[PDB]
Amino acid sequence: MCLKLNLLDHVFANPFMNAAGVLCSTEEDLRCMTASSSGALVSKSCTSAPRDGNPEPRYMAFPLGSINSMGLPNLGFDFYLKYASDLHDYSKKPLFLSISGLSVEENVAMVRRLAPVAQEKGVLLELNLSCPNVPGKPQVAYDFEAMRTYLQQVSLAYGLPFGVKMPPYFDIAHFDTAAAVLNEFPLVKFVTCVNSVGNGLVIDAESESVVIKPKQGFGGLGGKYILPTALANVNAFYRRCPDKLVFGCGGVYSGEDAFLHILAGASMVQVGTALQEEGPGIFTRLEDELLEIMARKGYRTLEEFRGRVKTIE
Amino acid sequence: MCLKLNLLDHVFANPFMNAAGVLCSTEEDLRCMTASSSGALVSKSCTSAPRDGNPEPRYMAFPLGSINSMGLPNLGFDFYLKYASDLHDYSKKPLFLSISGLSVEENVAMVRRLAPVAQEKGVLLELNLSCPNVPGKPQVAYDFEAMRTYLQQVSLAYGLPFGVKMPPYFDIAHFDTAAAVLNEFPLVKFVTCVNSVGNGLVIDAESESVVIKPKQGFGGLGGKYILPTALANVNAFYRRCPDKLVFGCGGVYSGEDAFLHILAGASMVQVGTALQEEGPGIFTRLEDELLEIMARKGYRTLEEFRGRVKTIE
Numbered sequence: 001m002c003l004k005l006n007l008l009d010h011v012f013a014n015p016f017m018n019a020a021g022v023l024c025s026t027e028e029d030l031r032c033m034t035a036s037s038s039g040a041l042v043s044k045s046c047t048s049a050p051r052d053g054n055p056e057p058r059y060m061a062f063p064l065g066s067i068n069s070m071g072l073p074n075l076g077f078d079f080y081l082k083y084a085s086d087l088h089d090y091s092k093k094p095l096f097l098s099i100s101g102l103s104v105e106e107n108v109a110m111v112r113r114l115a116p117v118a119q120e121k122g123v124l125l126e127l128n129l130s131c132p133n134v135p136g137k138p139q140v141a142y143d144f145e146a147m148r149t150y151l152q153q154v155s156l157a158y159g160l161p162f163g164v165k166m167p168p169y170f171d172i173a174h175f176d177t178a179a180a181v182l183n184e185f186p187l188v189k190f191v192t193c194v195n196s197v198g199n200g201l202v203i204d205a206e207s208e209s210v211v212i213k214p215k216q217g218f219g220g221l222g223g224k225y226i227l228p229t230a231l232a233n234v235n236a237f238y239r240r241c242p243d244k245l246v247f248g249c250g251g252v253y254s255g256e257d258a259f260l261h262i263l264a265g266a267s268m269v270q271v272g273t274a275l276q277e278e279g280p281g282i283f284t285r286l287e288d289e290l291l292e293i294m295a296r297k298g299y300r301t302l303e304e305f306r307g308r309v310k311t312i313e
Numbered sequence: 314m315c316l317k318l319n320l321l322d323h324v325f326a327n328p329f330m331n332a333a334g335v336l337c338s339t340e341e342d343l344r345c346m347t348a349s350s351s352g353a354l355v356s357k358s359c360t361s362a363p364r365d366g367n368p369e370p371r372y373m374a375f376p377l378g379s380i381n382s383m384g385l386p387n388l389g390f391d392f393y394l395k396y397a398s399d400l401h402d403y404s405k406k407p408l409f410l411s412i413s414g415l416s417v418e419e420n421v422a423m424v425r426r427l428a429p430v431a432q433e434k435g436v437l438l439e440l441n442l443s444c445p446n447v448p449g450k451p452q453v454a455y456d457f458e459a460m461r462t463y464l465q466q467v468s469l470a471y472g473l474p475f476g477v478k479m480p481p482y483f484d485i486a487h488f489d490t491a492a493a494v495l496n497e498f499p500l501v502k503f504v505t506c507v508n509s510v511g512n513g514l515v516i517d518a519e520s521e522s523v524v525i526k527p528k529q530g531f532g533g534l535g536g537k538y539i540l541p542t543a544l545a546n547v548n549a550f551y552r553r554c555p556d557k558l559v560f561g562c563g564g565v566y567s568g569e570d571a572f573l574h575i576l577a578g579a580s581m582v583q584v585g586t587a588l589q590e591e592g593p594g595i596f597t598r599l600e601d602e603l604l605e606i607m608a609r610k611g612y613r614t615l616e617e618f619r620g621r622v623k624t625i626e
């Protein structure tokens with residue numbers, strides 16, 4: 001019994017990969033994820049120019065999860081594109097490149113350059129919609145008219161299948177709106193649910209202080225805090241976008257957690273906080289654990305149970 | 314050392330109270346909460362007519378928290394108004410009455426009849442905005458125009474200081490907008506942050522099933538999942554609403570959790586999931602624990618540290 005699957009015209013050894021932003025910023029990080037047992041890897045979301053990001057400390061982790069306000073530190077698009085075009089070994093596993101430009105224009109400029117590399121090498125685009133918006137407005141994926149613009153502009157500029165990284169939603173009307181926006185765009189072939197749960201605040205009781213320096217301590221939450229939010233978003237979009245794939249992200253620490261994402265509808269399962277904490281060895285553990293749950297249940301394939309969460313009456 | 318507070322022209326022995334919905338639906342519940350060592354109590358969010366609520370199971374709890382889709386089961390406004398006007402022993406502690414009408418008109422009708430009882434007996438109104446409006450639209454506090462309409466109508470109808478129960482927000486632009494709406498209304502004297510984190514999804518791995526029956530298993534999350542979200546909201550409104558009080562709700566299981574709420578800006582601290590799971594004995598434990606942390610730190614009163622969370626550099 002093995003976990004290999006085929007999606008998006010690519011073959012994957014297993015459904016696991018890193019979450020964007022974790023273990024994927026530098027050449028060393030990408031080589032490390034390539035050497036791991038993960039089924040795929042995704043690069044750090046990039047901007048046109050390099051960024052240093054926010055002042056440290058900017059990430060912290062705890063038993064129940066993590067908080068971050070990294071500020072998009074990255075080596076710049078030219079680097080990630082060169083990695084995709086010249087350095088990545090596609091014989092080892094597929095590559096996703098994540099883009100999060102500061103404007104629609106920036107994204108368009110980056111995607112027009114990525115398109116020939118996608119055609120030649122098969123690198124897959126993940127568009128991070130947790131990105132800056134015009135004054136007074138929330139992040140792009142929380143402004144549905146902005147989202148529709150970005151997707152229209154990217155779809156025209158890129159012209160190839162791509163995916164989108166989504167923040168979580170918390171309201172059924174929002175799920176309905178957001179999924180309807182996505183379903184306007186046939187080139188959006190996968191939706192990754194979810195990014196960090198925004199603008200949480202961790203305070204340390206002893207020091208009476210927040211634990212990260214940017215944004216007066218506020219930052220995105222990941223890890224065990226967010227699993228039920230992640231599962232709800234996965235399933236909500238799985239239900240609403242039958243012609244798309246859903247990739248799950250959030251709160252995966254075990255094969256059981258992966259199993260729950262798959263039951264909710266996930267095709268690929270991304271690992272952020274737990275990977276940052278445990279390191280790339282986590283992928284062998286996750287695979288073993290998931291195969292063990294499958295074996296106990298009599299499942300031979302992922303397709304036997306993907307999306308098959310049961311409801312009551 | 315002491316936990317006393319004086320606010321809203323009332324005196325409280327300590328900051329602890331139930332969260333609306335928990336241990337507060339029936340007369341038996343309200344007598345229990347009154348007999349407890351909590352500083353105050355709040356009644357179940359009510360509607361004009363009695364409601365049976367959603368089918369069971371509609372609440373479940375687990376090590377990290379709870380999920381619920383109760384559907385507003387309650388005895389009807391006339392019951393809670395009678396409790397306020399004739400049954401509650403105000404010599405024991407203050408009472409809040411929570412309302413959650415299904416339209417603006419329904420809320421107006423209730424607060425019109427609550428006013429004279431508020432003025433004569435000193436019951437305090439908590440208006441639940443994290444609540445259904447037109448189906449297919451977001452909850453009221455996720456629809457800023459609706460929120461403003463509700464607040465204008467209830468302020469005119471009621472004419473006395475009240476407070477509002479808010480859902481969590483996740484985007485800084487939302488914190489800004491939401492606070493700006495609340496700050497239009499001088500009668501809104503307290504803001505309780507937060508109601509449950511909406512539409513999460515808990516799945517049980519063994520049975521491969523969701524754990525609550527309504528809404529295909531989607532429901533609001535409470536407990537350990539939501540403490541950093543709760544803290545963020547408390548602090549965000551604390552900073553943005555300097556002429557109002559903030560009451561904290563979410564993730565309180567210990568005196569330490571309560572101390573973090575208070576550092577964030579909380580005046581009263583409400584207990585939902587943990588009170589549901591432990592029972593009213595939790596209030597003596599929380600009091601003891603909070604007093605122990607105060608003694609270790611040399612704090613004599615709550616004002617010495619309320620809102621005094623430190624930021625980094």
Ligand SMILES: Cc1cc2nc3c(=O)[nH]c(=O)nc-3n(C[C@H](O)[C@H](O)[C@H](O)COP(=O)(O)O)c2cc1C
Nearest residue numbers: 019020021045194195196222223250251271272273
């Ligand atoms: C340190 C850090 C940096 C991240 N940077 C990005 C990023 O560049 N792009 C992105 O799409 N998400 C980013 N995320 C969000 C993660 O991809 C993931 O959505 C989130 O952490 C939830 O998954 P988890 O519960 O496994 O951590 C970052 C997360 C962390 C912890």
Ligand SMILES: Cc1cc2nc3c(=O)[nH]c(=O)nc-3n(C[C@H](O)[C@H](O)[C@H](O)COP(=O)(O)O)c2cc1C
Nearest residue numbers: 332333334358507508509535536563564584585586
């Ligand atoms: C069973 C149950 C019923 C609830 N009913 C209400 C309600 O009627 N009104 C309301 O404002 N909040 C209601 N809530 C939300 C809680 O008041 C509280 O905001 C939320 O549970 C988070 O706090 P916690 O982490 O301590 O559970 C309910 C929560 C639970 C668990």
Ligand SMILES: O=C(O)c1[nH]c(=O)[nH]c(=O)c1CCc1ccc(C(F)(F)F)cc1
Nearest residue numbers: 069070071072100101102130131196220
């Ligand atoms: O780098 C981060 O802080 C981060 N952390 C997350 O948990 N999720 C993310 O998606 C991100 C990146 C968010 C982001 C995207 C784009 C900009 C920019 F255009 F200004 F560079 C900034 C931050």
Ligand SMILES: O=C(O)c1[nH]c(=O)[nH]c(=O)c1CCc1ccc(C(F)(F)F)cc1
Nearest residue numbers: 358382383384385386443444508509533
């Ligand atoms: O009665 C509840 O379900 C409830 N639960 C909460 O966690 N917070 C609340 O404020 C409420 C009352 C408002 C309300 C009513 C109906 C629903 C539902 F139909 F989606 F279950 C949710 C929230």
